[PDB]
Scaffold this active site. Structure first.
Site, PDB file in Angstrom:
ATOM      1  N   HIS A  40      -9.218  15.012  -5.531  1.00  0.00           N
ATOM      2  CA  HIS A  40      -9.785  16.269  -5.593  1.00  0.00           C
ATOM      3  C   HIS A  40     -10.678  16.596  -4.233  1.00  0.00           C
ATOM      4  O   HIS A  40     -11.213  17.652  -4.337  1.00  0.00           O
ATOM      5  CB  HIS A  40     -11.031  16.040  -6.605  1.00  0.00           C
ATOM      6  CG  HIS A  40     -12.150  15.109  -6.342  1.00  0.00           C
ATOM      7  ND1 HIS A  40     -12.443  14.129  -7.186  1.00  0.00           N
ATOM      8  CD2 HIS A  40     -13.308  15.502  -5.502  1.00  0.00           C
ATOM      9  CE1 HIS A  40     -13.360  13.572  -6.863  1.00  0.00           C
ATOM     10  NE2 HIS A  40     -14.278  14.289  -5.816  1.00  0.00           N
ATOM     11  N   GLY A 142     -20.970  12.872  -2.262  1.00  0.00           N
ATOM     12  CA  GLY A 142     -20.602  12.393  -1.102  1.00  0.00           C
ATOM     13  C   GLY A 142     -19.985  10.711  -1.057  1.00  0.00           C
ATOM     14  O   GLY A 142     -19.293  10.311  -0.541  1.00  0.00           O
ATOM     15  N   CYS A 144     -17.431   9.954  -3.489  1.00  0.00           N
ATOM     16  CA  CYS A 144     -16.197   9.456  -4.191  1.00  0.00           C
ATOM     17  C   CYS A 144     -15.343   8.955  -3.274  1.00  0.00           C
ATOM     18  O   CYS A 144     -15.600   8.968  -1.930  1.00  0.00           O
ATOM     19  CB  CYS A 144     -15.854  11.203  -4.271  1.00  0.00           C
ATOM     20  SG  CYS A 144     -16.393  11.752  -5.826  1.00  0.00           S
TER      21      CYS A 144
END
Ligand code: A1AGX
Lengths: 299, 299
Positions: A40, A142, A144
């Site tokens: 993503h 942030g 991920c």
């Protein structure tokens, strides 16, 4: 003493990098000549609502991915997608790559999380895969691409990569093959999990730990059958205990001289009466994110 | 809110083992010095009542076995500083981070990297109790494990592990060998003072609850610092210092709630009880999250 303890994180720290595409920056895991990160990252604001990832991915070039290891930019020489993880081939191998494997953990198992931001490690903590396939983490914007892992001898077994937060404030993600734990999807929509249940075999491990450290007020002289305990357990949204769970608890049983089914009789009393204001190992709540192995290794 | 440790990699790269005879513990290898507890020089029977200066004069550099993994580091000099041994070695640690030695205050938190035979096993977060003990998790062979904070890229070492007390809590020194609290490194009965609750951290916790929208406990009144301290001591809470008032500054500013107003709210919770309510999903007030911990997990 007794503490929620994470694995030392150095071997994983030496693998973390920053991955940027457009106005989106998150973390990647750099093993050998490949960087793994959530797909993503390739999404815009608009995309995120219903991303046709195969479609979005084909429109990207290697040069649309900025990968940084500290000061150094790594050159992306190829990209592909495995389920919800993007794989970035880079021209250079990570010399700090440890002995590793990718595993899919079961609900009730625990692992360490190395929370990272902009490719930099910020903290480490221990989490469990909940029975409803969420994890109760501490993850901000942030985060991920942060990974969860266990270490066996010299080998790092990666089991989680972080992708999202649910409205209840718990977290969801994938294994390193990119398959989600649970019924979640990497799209910007509100998603609810199934109703959670408590990990009973871990609550029992933790009760044994409280005994090993001299805390036994919750014990009782009574006993119970396995099925009668399981009947009460399910009533209170606790996972039923299997004979494999009983067996796993043996060492703690032996070490303390408390039969598993006796401890089950103690837990049944706690479920039915509560803690009466008392605490166990400091907690007002029954803790269910220590496995039997966790308690064993540490005692 | 979880207890979150700092990533341990920068410290893992400094752990070694130090052996005298059959007595092995952990040491900290920074530049060309190894730091470790002086009681490594004591036979089991020496520990009952050691004379450290006499034990040391009998020692030579070549009686110290220092190993990184199974690789020997030759000792070329030795000295004693309070309760730590400093061993000069012939190799400067290539993994030495930016570092400093600090002596922390009761209430401050740090990460502990629990080690055995110079191998890291686990990392967890500790608070220094007002009675100068920590609620650790330490087995035989853990001495020389260190506690630390990481600021930017700089590791601040604040703790080195030496002993366990009758109540199952742990005691140790700073990296200058000065014990926290009134303990000595002799295998004799010692007792920690009665412990108290870390008021500044409870206040941080209340600020954390307000930041997350949980503010039923805020009241319309204030108090003086002196009145609060006198009341708090009657509930076995620590009196606040000016440094405490100062480090609550950012959370006060973030919420617009003056420190002394939050103190009045806490006094009311102490005098009237929770009346069955919860704060942040708990009837217990938490006291091992500092104002820095709160910030580093909310923002
Ligand atoms: C170094 O690894 C070791 C770490 C200890 C052992 C297991 N857990 C730990 O934290 N340190 C020692 O063995 C230490 C050596 C001495 C030179 C300081 N001695 C020690 O920890 O035990 C003696 C202590 C001192 C106060 C006291 O009352 N005491 C007796 C026992 C009694 C039973 C409970 C624990 C304390």
């Amino acid at each position: 003493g007794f503490r929620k303890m994470a694995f030392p994180s150095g071997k994983v720290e030496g693998c973390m990098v920053q991955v940027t595409c457009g106005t989106t920056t998150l973390n990647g895991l750099w093993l050998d000549d490949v960087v793994y990160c959530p797909r993503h990252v390739i999404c815009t604001s608009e995309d995120m609502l219903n991303p046709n990832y195969e479609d979005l991915l084909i429109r990207k070039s290697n040069h649309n991915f900025l990968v940084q290891a500290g000061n150094v930019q790594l050159r992306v020489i190829g990209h592909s997608m495995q389920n919800c993880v993007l794989k970035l081939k880079v021209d250079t191998a990570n010399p700090k790559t440890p002995k590793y494997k990718f595993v899919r953990i079961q609900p009730g198992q625990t692992f360490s999380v190395l929370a990272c931001y902009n490719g930099s490690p910020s903290g480490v903590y221990q989490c469990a895969m909940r029975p409803n396939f969420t994890i109760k983490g501490s993850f901000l914007n942030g985060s991920c691409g942060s990974v969860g892992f266990n270490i066996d001898y010299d080998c790092v077994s990666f089991c989680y990569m972080h992708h999202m937060e649910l409205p209840t404030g718990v977290h969801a993600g994938t294994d390193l093959e990119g398959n989600f734990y649970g019924p979640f999807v990497d799209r910007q929509t509100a998603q609810a999990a199934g109703t959670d249940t408590t990990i009973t075999v871990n609550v029992l491990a933790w009760l044994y730990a409280a005994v090993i450290n001299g805390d036994r007020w919750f014990l009782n002289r009574f006993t119970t059958t396995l099925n009668d305990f399981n009947l009460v357990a399910m009533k209170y949204n606790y996972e039923p205990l299997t004979q494999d769970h009983v067996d796993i608890l043996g060492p703690l049983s032996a070490q303390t001289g408390i039969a598993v089914l006796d401890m089950c009789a103690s837990l049944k009393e706690l479920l039915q009466n509560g803690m009466n204001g008392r605490t166990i190992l400091g907690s007002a709540l029954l803790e269910d994110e220590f496995t039997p192995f966790d308690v064993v290794r540490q005692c």
